[PDB]
Amino acid sequence: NVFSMFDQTQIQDFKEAFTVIDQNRDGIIDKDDLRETFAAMGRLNVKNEELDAMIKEASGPINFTVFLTMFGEKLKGADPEDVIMGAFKVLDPDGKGSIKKSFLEELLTTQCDRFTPEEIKNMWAAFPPDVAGNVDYKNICYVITHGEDK
């Protein structure tokens, strides 16, 4: 599933990300490579159990492919931002100003079995303010592709 969405651009973003964590340039990221990438980003308080927890997710040396497979496997239902924006633009169909909370609450719960009312309240809390104001779909897309603080 993890090689089927997954475009060349996404994969290059990942390749560059790997080479930035890959301190030694060897081709395999290890505990040492993780330690000074954390240090270069300002994080000095790193304990071995956290570094080890990271590495334990893979069965072998963390090599480009083992990385790409492990990160794909967690994003099995995740698109690139423009594609996600298309789904909202279809729900927008009139254009420019994004949708209201009620209109999508109902459409996530209704056709099919469930986007559950536990999942949806977590959605209004983790998607915001945004979801209250303009149900800011533009913002929603940027936070899922680019991190939570941004």
UniProtKB/Swiss-Prot annotation:
GO MF annotation: an example: calcium ion binding
Alphabetical UniProt keywords: Calcium, Metal-binding, Methylation, Motor protein, Muscle protein, Myosin, Phosphoprotein, Repeat
Residue stretches making up the EF-hand domain: 9-44, 79-114, 115-150
One GO cellular component term: myosin complex
Post-translational modifications: The N-terminus is blocked. N,N,N-trimethylalanine, found in other myosin light chains would not have been detected in the N-terminal tryptic peptide in PubMed:7358336 because it would remain trimethylated and ninhydrin negative after hydrolysis.
Pfam families per UniProt: EF-hand_6
Positions contributing to Ca(2+) binding: 22, 24, 26, 33
InterPro entries registered for this protein in UniProt: EF-hand-dom_pair, EF_Hand_1_Ca_BS, EF_hand_dom, Myosin_RLC
An individual GO BP term: skeletal muscle tissue development
Listed SUPFAM superfamilies: EF-hand
Domain of life per record: Eukaryota
PROSITE patterns: EF_HAND_1 (PS00018), EF_HAND_2 (PS50222)
Task performed by this protein: Myosin regulatory subunit that plays an essential to maintain muscle integrity during early development. Plays a role in muscle contraction.
Note: This chain binds calcium.
Subunit and interaction comment: Myosin is a hexamer of 2 heavy chains and 4 light chains.
UniProt-recorded name of the protein: Myosin regulatory light chain 11
